[PDB]
Design a protein around this nucleic acid. Sequence first.
RNA 1: GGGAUAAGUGCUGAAAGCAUCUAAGCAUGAAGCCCCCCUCAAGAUGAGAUUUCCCAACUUCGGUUAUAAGAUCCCUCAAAG
RNA 2: UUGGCACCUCGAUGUCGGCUCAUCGCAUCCUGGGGCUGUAGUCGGUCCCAAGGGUUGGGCUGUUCGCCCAUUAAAGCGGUACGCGAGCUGGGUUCAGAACGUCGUGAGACAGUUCGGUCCCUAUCCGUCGUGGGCGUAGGAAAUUUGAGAGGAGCUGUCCUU
RNA 3: AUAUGUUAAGUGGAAAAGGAUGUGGCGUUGCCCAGACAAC
Lengths: 215, 145, 58, 37, 175
Amino acid sequence: TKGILGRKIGMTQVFGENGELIPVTVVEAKENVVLQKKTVEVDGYNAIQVGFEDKKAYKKDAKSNKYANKPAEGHAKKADAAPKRFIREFRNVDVDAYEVGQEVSVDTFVAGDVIDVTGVSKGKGFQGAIKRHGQSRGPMSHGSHFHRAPGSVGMASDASRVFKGQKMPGRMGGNTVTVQNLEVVQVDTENKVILVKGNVPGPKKGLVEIRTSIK
Amino acid sequence: MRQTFMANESNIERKWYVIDAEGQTLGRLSSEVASILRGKNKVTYTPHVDTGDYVIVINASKIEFTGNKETDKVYYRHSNHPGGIKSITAGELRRTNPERLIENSIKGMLPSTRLGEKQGKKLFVYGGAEHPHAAQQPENYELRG
Amino acid sequence: LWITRINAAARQHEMSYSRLMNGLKKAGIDINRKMLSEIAISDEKAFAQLVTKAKDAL
Amino acid sequence: MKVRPSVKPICEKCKVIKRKGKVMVICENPKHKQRQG
Amino acid sequence: SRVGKKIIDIPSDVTVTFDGNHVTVKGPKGELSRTLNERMTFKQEENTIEVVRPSDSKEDRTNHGTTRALLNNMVQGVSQGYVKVLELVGVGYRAQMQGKDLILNVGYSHPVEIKAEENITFSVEKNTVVKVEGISKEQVGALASNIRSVRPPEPYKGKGIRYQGEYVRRKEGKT
RNA sequence: GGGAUAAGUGCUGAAAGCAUCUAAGCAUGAAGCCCCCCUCAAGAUGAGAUUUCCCAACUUCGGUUAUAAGAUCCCUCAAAG
RNA sequence: UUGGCACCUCGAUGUCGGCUCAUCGCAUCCUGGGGCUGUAGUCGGUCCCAAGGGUUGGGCUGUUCGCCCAUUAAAGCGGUACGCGAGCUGGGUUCAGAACGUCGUGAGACAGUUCGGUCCCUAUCCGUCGUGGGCGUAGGAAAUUUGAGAGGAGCUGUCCUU
RNA sequence: AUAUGUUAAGUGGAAAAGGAUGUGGCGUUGCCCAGACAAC
Ligand SMILES: [Mg+2]
Ligand SMILES: [Mg+2]
Ligand SMILES: [Mg+2]
Ligand SMILES: [Mg+2]
Ligand SMILES: [Mg+2]
Ligand SMILES: [Mg+2]
Ligand SMILES: [Mg+2]
Ligand SMILES: [Mg+2]
Ligand SMILES: [Mg+2]
Ligand SMILES: [Mg+2]
Ligand SMILES: [Mg+2]
Ligand SMILES: [Mg+2]
Ligand SMILES: [Mg+2]
Ligand SMILES: [Mg+2]
Ligand SMILES: [Mg+2]
Ligand SMILES: [Mg+2]
Ligand SMILES: [Mg+2]
Ligand SMILES: [Mg+2]
């Protein structure tokens, strides 16, 4: 249960009870609406889908993404709503709540809940073997000509090939990753933020998916 | 090179049969079916075109084995990764995805050519007595045992 | 190729290939495999008639 | 349990049986348990 | 089959009902059933069941001995029932009832609860002696073996759950 | 955490009037097997599913023309490269 | 392993140890589950199932190997051109110099010591790591998805109660 | 395909000394319904 969407803002700290200091990531989770209810009869699995951040309406000569287009307009009208930027699905929730067109408010979480956060990583570009994997580097003196290369890549002539999954260089990059068993420490209703204890993947103004813990 | 009939397109007729698989052993069913799909019961058989016709197998969860080869007779598989050998037993495939049990036995009895791949797509296998293909009007076919 | 077609045409009359050309020899017929394959494609009614002359010669 | 390629009776109370393709002996004291292999 | 040829099998007020393969048996404390065997032929002279083997093979010889054995257990347990008795040996080993279930205390750091099942009654004599009563012989044999496996007997002193007539081989290991 | 198993422990039980964990039957049992957790994944040529948007004449329809929804060229950029 | 044979390689299959990077087997070092014990307990011995993961830092030697100091749950045995030099060192050794001992009439030698002594190559194909264009998927587009299959992860101690 | 039989181990479709109430066939010879051969 209890899914919501938001974007990263930054990172601060909060003094807990009895003077304990805890690092805090602040997530703004604003104007989330329920946009389509999916059914095991029509689709084969029960889920809801949620749109996060609204954008401007249809225009004739749009040249970018901040104006919705005609397929997105009709989809976001069948539920009476404004067109959104991010749309995800949550299939952990109970589908018998959540009438279509509701606003999932930020205070569906209470301080003390354990949650899981999902986002995409930062992204580093083309990176070598000792950065991308945790490899040891060669000696830096005593005549060596081997500093940051990878080592050997196989055997001799039995297996006259390189096996796959060999950890060569390439794009380090940002891919999806979840962190588990975090906590909600303080929920602000007026500013519509959530404070979570720890740190979440992604750059600033990213996109995070918060849902309750599976364990 | 006097005179010998050679089949052709605009020349051949394909029809639809239905086999039921209950009470039949796996290999002795499969050897019969693979000669239907190649067309070796037509009098106009020619080796370089696709004569032969469509087969539907409908029960496929009541296939029998003899001996102890439902706990033995494992099926292996490799993923082209180091140490990626994987396996499943024959009794396991019967209770879970039994359609792939039969169609792997039959496609192993077909040649590995370009035509042999195209002939193997004329097989349709279902667990339990229903099939969608009532529009094509198939017939019953009893196995010449 | 000729034998494969004769074997298909004989099994529509409940005969093997083997017992067809056994009994066809004892009847005294000396027709080819090539000619016997063409009769079964062209004239099915004539092919069924020499099946019976092979079948009662056994 | 003594596993050895040569299973035999030791005293006069031990007896020879088969369980699932394997030759065993069963006796009253537990020092005589043998299975062939 | 000298035990299969002894196919008298004298009934009682228990009622025997054949149904082909599976056979239902009902009496004072009845309602038993078992899918027996396909080959074996069943007959009742007046009320006594009798079992005749056909074909005299090796497989027909053995199953003729077991099929008579299973029928005699199905009718005699409805008639009288089966009771297996076992005892506790050791200081502070207390067992007691929790209504339907059974609670043991055998020297662990926590008590052990045996959840009851159908057709079986537990009873405790003097916090040491536990009785298991029932109608089908394989069922009471299974549960009586399950609960002695909590703490089996011990060679050096003899402590643990023991059958009421079980002999225990004892060693004498002194410091 | 669930299911099936290994060595092993058993229940009932004949062949062989006994006994017997087995032959027919019923249980239990490892961090190992399959699920459970994370990630990629319909070029899965078997190419899947749901929601929404759009619909033309000439014509020798041989193809031509202009086009819809939607994209791109081009320019200002970075949370990405 | 030391060897026997002399079948490919003499119009070159070009190097011992160490470094970097791994992968497989199990005749199992630790952890897991059991039997027997001449197993009171705590500890142990021996056998069976089991290859998921894990399996140390230094001193002396070119050293493999080995000894020792301290730790650890443990400090396993082997295969892969005695794994890997178109990925690295170059201490060792089959090079030219020189010296000791010994042998030799002598030029020289030992296989016995010691000091010193040049490691080339812009990756075509297969292969691997990452990233794009084209077409197809019986109308064309935008967006959200199922998951056949595949990959990863899989360790362990000490203390307190009972 | 005909007819007769053996095998239950996927033996077939890679090996020995030894061990064994695994199952078929052929012989010689003991105790037999006076009651053996088991269990009581
Ligand atoms: Mg280093
Ligand atoms: Mg011995
Ligand atoms: Mg900025
Ligand atoms: Mg050699
Ligand atoms: Mg030579
Ligand atoms: Mg020679
Ligand atoms: Mg050359
Ligand atoms: Mg082993
Ligand atoms: Mg020093
Ligand atoms: Mg080497
Ligand atoms: Mg090399
Ligand atoms: Mg010199
Ligand atoms: Mg001299
Ligand atoms: Mg110098
Ligand atoms: Mg120097
Ligand atoms: Mg030197
Ligand atoms: Mg074999
Ligand atoms: Mg052998």
